[PDB]
């Protein structure tokens, strides 16, 4: 076979150890999920906007008492107007307060006021993968593989908890001071025991079943991993057009073309992730995530060493000191105005 006796027994023992880890991880998650206003706005000095989105902005803030820096996501309650907007914001808080994994951003505080919802996360100063990738063009295969391995392990963790992530893309992957990834933006994450039906995500990363208004499962995250690996290694995603409708048409077609510099191992992995037929998509088969982890493209990957952060990162961001924002792009700044009247109080009672 491909493995001799020694390698095959090592892999099996590895599989039992994964089961053991995930069983303990589920016990710890459920305790936090079942038993979850840890600050207020005036406790922080607001420094700079780090990014923007539909419902608001993320700002670097400094906690006045401790001097620690954080990334504060501010959501305007009224702008969280869409029905699926409300439920999604509650999902995001509840999931982030219960998970614990080395490649997931850590939520430290959450609170609300008359106008806004706030989620205060650890500040990750190395910037988004997005801007590093756009600046350099593309990552070499070993570099892309180092990041992809972290996503594979993160999805193995999340999916074992019946959590789907639903917004993988370089914009949502922060680079930490050791060159490892922190996944942020859990705005579309959801606990799903079987299928779910919301039409949400980012166009370039949507699996065909989402676009086709079919109920779907955690396999959409594995499709998205294929898009991410392609984009990391090529510099552009596989379904690439100026308008969403054109993007959707390419995704559903079942056609992908690869740069001539992609290795055959990489193309094989990507053809099995970017598989329209759910009975054939890696991550969705009887062997689950192991079809991905045992693929030839990952043969040099020491999964435990990645998890333990023992592997030398391909790129270490420069850091000038606490609160340095040099690795982030600039955004228009707008003052945070808090109304004297409570907005949408009934809709956000649970937050």
């Amino acid at each position: 076979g491909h493995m001799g006796n020694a390698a095959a027994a090592k892999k099996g023992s590895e599989q039992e150890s994964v089961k053991e880890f995930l069983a303990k991880a589920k016990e710890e998650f459920l305790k936090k999920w079942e038993s979850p206003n840890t600050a207020q706005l005036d406790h922080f000095d607001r420094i700079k906007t780090l990014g923007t989105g539909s419902f608001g902005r993320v700002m670097l803030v400094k906690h006045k008492e401790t001097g620690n820096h954080y990334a504060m996501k501010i959501l305007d309650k009224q702008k969280v107007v869409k029905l699926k907007q409300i439920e999604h914001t509650l999902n995001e808080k509840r999931i982030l307060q219960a998970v614990n994994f080395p490649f997931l951003v850590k939520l430290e505080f959450s609170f609300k006021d008359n106008s806004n919802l706030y989620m205060v996360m650890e500040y990750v100063p190395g910037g988004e993968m997005f801007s590093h990738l756009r600046r350099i063009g593309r990552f070499s295969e070993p570099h892309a593989r180092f990041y992809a391995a972290q996503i594979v392990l993160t999805f193995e963790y999340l999916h074992s908890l019946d959590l789907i992530y639903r917004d993988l893309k370089p914009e949502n992957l922060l680079i930490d001071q050791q060159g490892y990834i922190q996944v942020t933006d859990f705005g579309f994450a959801k606990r799903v025991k079987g299928r779910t039906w919301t039409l949400c995500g980012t166009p370039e990363y949507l699996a065909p079943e989402i676009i086709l208004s079919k109920g779907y499962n955690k396999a959409v995250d594995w499709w998205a991993l294929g898009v991410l690996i392609y984009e990391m290694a090529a510099g552009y995603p596989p379904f690439f057009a100026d308008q969403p409708i054109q993007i959707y048409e390419k995704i559903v077609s079942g056609k992908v073309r690869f740069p001539s510099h992609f290795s055959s191992d990489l193309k094989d992995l990507l053809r099995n992730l970017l598989q329209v037929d759910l009975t054939k998509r890696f991550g969705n088969l009887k062997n689950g995530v192991n079809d991905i982890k045992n693929h030839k493209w990952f043969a040099t990957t020491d999964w435990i060493a990645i998890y333990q952060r023992k592997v030398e990162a391909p790129f270490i961001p420069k850091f000038k000191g606490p609160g340095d924002t040099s690795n982030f792009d600039d955004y228009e700044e707008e003052e945070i105005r808090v109304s004297i009247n409570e907005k949408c109080g009934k809709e956000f009672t649970e937050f």
């Binding site: 539909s54 869409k82 980012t202 370039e204 552009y236 969403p244």
Partner: peptide, 13 residues
């Protein structure tokens, strides 16, 4: 030709 800047999520396709 395709989108080269940051890509926003969609709440409804």
């Amino acid at each position: 030709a395709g989108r080269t800047g940051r890509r926003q999520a969609i709440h409804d396709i």
